Structure 1
Amino acid sequence: GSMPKPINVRVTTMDAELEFAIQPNTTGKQLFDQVVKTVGLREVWFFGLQYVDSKGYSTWLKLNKKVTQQDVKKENPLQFKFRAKFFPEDVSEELIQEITQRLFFLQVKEAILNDEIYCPPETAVLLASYAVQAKYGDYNKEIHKPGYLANDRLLPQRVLEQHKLTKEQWEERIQNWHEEHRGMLREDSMMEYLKIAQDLEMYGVNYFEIKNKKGTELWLGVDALGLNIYEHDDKLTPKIGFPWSEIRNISFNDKKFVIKPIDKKAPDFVFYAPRLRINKRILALCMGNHELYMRRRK
């Protein structure tokens, strides 16, 4: 005789925590579908479940395999992060539910405040003002006294290191933009934020460290639109672009990655990843993004 051996898991979104039990034969898709059911999200094609493997490596959970058969780490509750893996080409057209908008807003704002996306200072200040309007609501001089933003994490650190102003000057500029949003609904605010963030050059780009045959260190970008190559010191502006419509075939063998063009007159592009794992992640992101790109154009 015997009994089932359930398995506790914890799944966090950007603003929520879920805890429940699964079975030794529970698939990732079954876990994913229960996550999005409980929070009421239908725009699921953007998202995945992040976990940490036995060796501390961050990993996207494969939905066509069992949750317990992917070397997820030992914790009585298994720990998953529900996050966006793909980003829309246009937030105003593609993010319909308020849950989806809020989750993208929270995730993108986290990336910006973590200095992942280069931001010009006046853009950063306008971004913060929308985040303030979404959090505080309408500015009121009798409620929001001077210093009301003093404990808010408002700007990316690297904006503060380059453009030199005092803490109170930054907040006064942010407060001044907060005032002009007197009409804005919280949900409308997060969308204005997203509409601004999505035009930043580094927004939505997955960056990987690579080299070419001669050994020059480059950056490889994967985004909703295709691939890009950057020089080592400039992650903003691609040096070579690889839009989907120009790519005929991408492939890798161990560390060697090859991009082949539709126009046979153009030369194949070849670069080298440090690990096989890197090339696998690049290909999963290429295939996912290209798939969503195609579906939008049907």
Structure 2
Amino acid sequence: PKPINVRVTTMDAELEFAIQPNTTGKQLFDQVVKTVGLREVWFFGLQYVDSKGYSTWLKLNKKVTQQDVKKENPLQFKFRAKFFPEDVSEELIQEITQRLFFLQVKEAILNDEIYCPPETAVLLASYAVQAKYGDYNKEIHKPGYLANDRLLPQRVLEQHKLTKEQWEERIQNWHEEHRGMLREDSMMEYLKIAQDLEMYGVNYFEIKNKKGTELWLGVDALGLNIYEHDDKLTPKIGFPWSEIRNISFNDKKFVIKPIDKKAPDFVFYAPRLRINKRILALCMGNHELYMRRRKPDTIEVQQMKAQARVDSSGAA
């Protein structure tokens, strides 16, 4: 059989190679995972674009080429965080996990995919500079050191009237105060502030209700939420896992059956059947981890948290 060109990219890597034409998604995954030395695999997946212009997640069970993968050379893939923990502090154990979450989240905030207010964005920026350059040194980090760096969301630079050097001074002032903070600590402090942002870790889906009004369905670690089309920060209606008895779809109709037997089922419409299938898969994947983290840590996890306790110690 003729080999297929695949190119899985990490937030800070690029992995080009070939596999068997009749190879599963888990084989590609298990390969990417080992090449990179990632063990907390449960937060990740391989994202790809299809024939309709959608960015979904590779199914591990099926063959790579069978699930609608945009045909090209090489076959573009992206190793990314698919699930976000409820608390980054106690759930992202290893350094490689933390680094990958940091880069993806930072990339998303910078691209304006996740909203961030101006002051918070600057504070985030300084943690990013502290993480890249390390301790601020007046002698080496001479004025203009942050001129080649993209630090703020494009939309905060536009909504706020400050010159280029002024913004760089705001971030510099914060950088100075982070002295002593290691890279791992700096990225985690970044993620700690980022995880409280309204749009962080939310998977948005363009939907419509019975009437026809355009809405947004958001799927995250805690449940489902319906948003008004021009407001993706504040949910108009929320559905925590604890208030949902059942979730299902019928062609283009998705139904959320509440626990309260006196409340009406929430019904929405997706543009296509594939959307509803992906919506249910994500919900199940998030609820799965929601349950998993509420059950005692696996022997493997207990050991990783024990290994990180050592890699953070400064004693001989």
Same fold (TM over 0.5): yes
Q: Deviations over 1:181-228 (max 9, x none)?
A: 111111111110000000001111111222222222222111100011
Equivalent-residue separation in structure 1 for 2:87 and 2:179 (angstroms): 25
Contact 2:249 2:276 in 1 (8 A): yes
Q: Extract unaligned runs of 5+ from structure 1.
A: none
Measured after TM superposition, the shift of residue 55 of structure 1 is: 4.9
Match of 1:68, SS state, is: coil
Equivalent-residue separation in structure 2 for 1:121 and 1:292 (angstroms): 33
Equivalent-residue separation in structure 2 for 1:133 and 1:163 (angstroms): 23
Measured after TM superposition, the shift of residue 236 of structure 1 is: 1.0
> Which segment drifts farther, 93-102 or 201-210?
201-210
Find the partner of 1:25 among 14, 22, 26.
22
Contact 2:56 2:278 in 1 (8 A): no
RMSD: 1.4
> Which segment drifts farther, 110-119 or 213-222?
213-222
Measured after TM superposition, the shift of residue 141 of structure 1 is: 1.0
Equivalent-residue separation in structure 2 for 1:7 and 1:125 (angstroms): 44
Q: Deviations over 1:214-268 (max 9, x none)?
A: 2222221111000111222221111111000000001111221110011101111
Measured after TM superposition, the shift of residue 145 of structure 1 is: 1.2
Q: Deviations over 1:79-115 (max 9, x none)?
A: 2111111111111111011000000000000100010
Normalising by structure 2, we get a TM-score of 0.89
- C-alpha change, 1:21 and 1:182, in structure 2 (3 Å) is same
Measured after TM superposition, the shift of residue 54 of structure 1 is: 4.3
Match of 1:160, SS state, is: helix
Contact 2:24 2:62 in 1 (8 A): yes
> Which segment drifts farther, 54-63 or 79-88?
54-63
- Count of paired positions: 294
Alignment of 1:103-142 (within 5 A): 103-142=100-139
Equivalent-residue separation in structure 1 for 2:211 and 2:72 (angstroms): 45
Measured after TM superposition, the shift of residue 60 of structure 1 is: 1.3
Equivalent-residue separation in structure 2 for 1:164 and 1:277 (angstroms): 44
- C-alpha change, 1:84 and 1:177, in structure 2 (3 Å) is same
Measured after TM superposition, the shift of residue 10 of structure 1 is: 1.4
Q: Extract unaligned runs of 5+ from structure 2.
A: 295-316
Contact 2:254 2:268 in 1 (8 A): yes
Measured after TM superposition, the shift of residue 143 of structure 1 is: 0.9
Match of 1:11, SS state, is: strand
- C-alpha change, 1:201 and 1:37, in structure 2 (3 Å) is same
- Structure 1 segments, 4+ long, off by >4 Å, are none
Equivalent-residue separation in structure 2 for 1:157 and 1:258 (angstroms): 37
Equivalent-residue separation in structure 1 for 2:215 and 2:76 (angstroms): 34
- C-alpha change, 1:207 and 1:74, in structure 2 (3 Å) is closer
Match of 2:173, SS state, is: helix
Equivalent-residue separation in structure 2 for 1:109 and 1:170 (angstroms): 18
> Which segment drifts farther, 272-281 or 178-187?
272-281
